[PDB]
Design a protein around this ligand. Sequence first.
Ligand SMILES: COc1cc(CC(=O)N2CCC(NC(=O)NCc3ccc(OC(F)(F)F)cc3)CC2)cc(OC)c1
Ligand SMILES: COc1cc(CC(=O)N2CCC(NC(=O)NCc3ccc(OC(F)(F)F)cc3)CC2)cc(OC)c1
Ligand SMILES: [Mg+2]
Ligand SMILES: [Mg+2]
Lengths: 548, 548
Amino acid sequence: MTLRAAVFDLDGVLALPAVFGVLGRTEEALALPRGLLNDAFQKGGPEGATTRLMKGEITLSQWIPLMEENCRKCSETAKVCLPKNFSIKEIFDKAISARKINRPMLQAALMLRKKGFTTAILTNTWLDDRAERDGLAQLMCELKMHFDFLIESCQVGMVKPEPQIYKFLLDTLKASPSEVVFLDDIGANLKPARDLGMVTILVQDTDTALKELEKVTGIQLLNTPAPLPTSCNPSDMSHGYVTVKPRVRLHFVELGSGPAVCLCHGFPESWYSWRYQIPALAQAGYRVLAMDMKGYGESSAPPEIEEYCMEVLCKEMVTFLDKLGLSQAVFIGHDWGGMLVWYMALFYPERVRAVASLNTPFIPANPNMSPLESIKANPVFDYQLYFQEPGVAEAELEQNLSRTFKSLFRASDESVLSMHKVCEAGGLFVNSPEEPSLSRMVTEEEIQFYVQQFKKSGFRGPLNWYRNMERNWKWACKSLGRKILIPALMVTAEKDFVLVPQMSQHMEDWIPHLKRGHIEDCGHWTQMDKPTEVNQILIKWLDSDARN
Amino acid sequence: MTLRAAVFDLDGVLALPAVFGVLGRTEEALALPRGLLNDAFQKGGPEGATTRLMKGEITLSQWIPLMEENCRKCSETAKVCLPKNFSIKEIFDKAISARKINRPMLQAALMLRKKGFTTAILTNTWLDDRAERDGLAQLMCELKMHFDFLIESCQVGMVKPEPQIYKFLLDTLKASPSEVVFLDDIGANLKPARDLGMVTILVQDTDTALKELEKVTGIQLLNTPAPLPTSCNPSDMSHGYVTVKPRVRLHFVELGSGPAVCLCHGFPESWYSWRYQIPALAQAGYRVLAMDMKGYGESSAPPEIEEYCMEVLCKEMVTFLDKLGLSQAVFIGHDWGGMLVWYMALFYPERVRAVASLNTPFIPANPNMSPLESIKANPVFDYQLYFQEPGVAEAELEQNLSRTFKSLFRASDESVLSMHKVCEAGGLFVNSPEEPSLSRMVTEEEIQFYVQQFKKSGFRGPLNWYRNMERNWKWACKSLGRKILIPALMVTAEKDFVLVPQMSQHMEDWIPHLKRGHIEDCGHWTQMDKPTEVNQILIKWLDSDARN
Ligand SMILES: COc1cc(CC(=O)N2CCC(NC(=O)NCc3ccc(OC(F)(F)F)cc3)CC2)cc(OC)c1
Ligand SMILES: COc1cc(CC(=O)N2CCC(NC(=O)NCc3ccc(OC(F)(F)F)cc3)CC2)cc(OC)c1
Ligand SMILES: [Mg+2]
Ligand SMILES: [Mg+2]
């Protein structure tokens, strides 16, 4: 009785404008009799060319000549002449290409699945072997990924509105008719579903159909708050492993095609910290490589400290590119990752297409001051001195992993940590709760992912990033005569109280053509705090500075 | 005393023409005093702009203005006027871009390393932050991969001919001066090496220098037979894992950037069977995904037979693309892989940029004949009936893995197997040696790689590809009304006595625009038999039919 599944037509529902709507305009534009194109499209009914195409018996390219002959046949009976320019191939290329995802509809399908619905796309479609077929493929992938099932007439050999396909749908959904709502823009397609007893919504305009669907499901789908960007399910990702030297292999996650964009997380994070950027960046036309940095996750975590100086970390990233066969990548870092990407740009500009850092400014080494002196001359960096002694901070951070990340991963108005009193107090969590509340930015499940990751190797490796102050300083001094002249983006976050925006104020002295982004009401954990804003800044910058 | 290391200069030795040679012509072309450009380039000596650039103190972009001022200063002392068009940036862009690998030199370095030499590149070079820097990066990667060490003045802060860099070289090589031969096109660079006592060759013309190097090493480097293409070292590859459904994950190897090219091996092979194509295809501008097919290697090998029908195999390849975020890939198959790629093109043309098969023709299902009847009506396919009974062929093939692959992987003039008497004789190796000789196509090490791979899961999974004759037939019949109209390449091999070229003779009936390649004196194992010819055919076809 209570709905438990939602089925969406594609053309005219999830994807607008519908092909019929474009063809309708094509008829007018070309001064053809009203409906002639639709007549030709449907000639023969169940036994005609278009039903054979929709059942997969023939390909779209095979079907164009038949469509052409139907159009001639139709114009002849109508005592009209088709234009000299008449091309079914061009007409459908246009129509197919004009079709965009109906975002309010997709987001309602997503909301329904979030609340426990099985969702499916049921569409009459064709095997597309046009030279331009990649466009449609990209559209289906982007929709496909958000649904439990994609049922295509041409893969199952059945078409709407044949009753057999709705029985196939119901068996695929493992649900009974009255448990399913089906949305289609063609009433003929609803009749058989209605017969079986499933709820049907005839989609004329999206918002009316969404109101009907809100009513029958009891879920608010119209006027919902803005949803977060698509996240990553770890077990659905492609996982990559590259041995950069004996005993040291880098793990990374890969999604998308196009120019390589390597994401480098900070302390104490993971490739998963980019989970909101990976699908967006892949969707925007990039090949994203989200890495578990050295010391983290499934990446090797040797115990020696000097394995984590910036010079060794940067050479390994370079080896990573070599072994993957990438002459270049865009490097996008956050926190310690942002520091690493700056030095990638300073020491290996030929391998860096463009560099972006979130939060972490480029601070040139001061040759007249030991890095220890400078750290001591900033109370907010006091916690770093606490990280110096091997084993001390490891023991506090490894004691209760859930508490560690629940205490760390918090929005600016939820913090339970005072980074400036750490040494004095003898610890990072000294005056922090034993069972902190779950921040709004994270779910218990996301927390548990990080917990599982850091069970592999703990915090030794990740803390070792802090234990090469002098080594990094000596190496960084070698670059004091350089400038960064490749495309470069600095993104500041208003409420990062450690890496404050002001820290970046002098960066243009070393990066003259630096581009900037700013995110308001954003704490240190920028990617999960303001994912939608990050993705907009990053994607805009990529398209203007990293793509050709 | 006996040489054990070889050191190669880059500019003028491994890479031609040298930059000085282009600049020399630029001087003439622009009617400048002879040597003025070289004067400006060198002004200041150890303390001038170019030495700072070569030591990494500044970047190339920072160095252009200084070079410009040196050129003005030089033309002024020479009482000449630089042209109105004068641009150091353009002059060096041209020179850098004109530089190609000196293939006879690289191949001698490769031959030397094959015979046990430690090889290194020692070059004065710069940090390249030009907009065009990707060109140089690609050049270094392609050379880099063939050498034990790349020593760049700008990464080590030392330049030829300073004696310190040759002591750094010697320590990097772990060798003593008289054990090393050093080749450079600038005599000033040889003097310090000679001082230490290492053999030096002044490279004026490549062949003279190669004769000198043949003499001192005792190895023939000039007029050597054609070398095989670059192969793959498994532990140097990026390894990818994609879960396509519960219990089933696909393993693949990834190299290169550009359009995705998925390689699908046959029975009983491995991603490694493409080892000669992967680097070539990556080098040609493609992102290669060499897969361990379902049942093989590090890919899952469920025991049930129907997990290996073509329909399930093809859907999983599609899921593989979805989870990697590729709307399309080029599919290049061999043997059973070639059959799979044809059906990828028949059932998922929108996901297939282009399809190529080696050896395996597209044979449309005969709806009036059970596949068993047709197999029985060809003596050469008799071995397939032997593969039908679960466990029988597994036991013979798994008994001695070394013998299995030494018996299988053989050139046409080395065969020890009679595929037409298999059932009668009761086995594939019945009348074959217990310790077969090593074919010329493979090394003992390559054999052992396959041995290790098939220890993971044995032959059940791979043999199950043969055990869905009826299932595959019923599914293939659904496509009998289709044509393959995407870009398509059929490559035949003259001496494949199972998959004979004649088998493909009718393919144009179903693939009208089919392109063809033919390889003479080539047996069934086409990729390792004629790797150089495969790579030429494939790469030519890719550039004309899969790239935009
Ligand atoms: C290394 O020495 C320096 C570093 C800099 C700047 C710089 O590159 N950094 C990046 C790498 C480090 N980041 C880090 O420790 N982040 C971890 C973290 C942040 C906030 C947290 O708090 C909360 F959870 F969010 F609430 C909790 C944990 C230091 C900053 C400048 C300089 O001199 C001017 C010296
Ligand atoms: C499936 O039924 C069929 C298949 C076809 C053609 C086709 O697609 N094939 C590809 C898949 C199979 N390849 C295979 O078994 N290769 C293994 C192998 C080859 C040579 C060997 O010998 C030596 F080692 F090289 F010496 C040893 C092992 C059968 C051929 C046509 C058809 O009907 C017309 C029916
Ligand atoms: Mg529709
Ligand atoms: Mg030189």
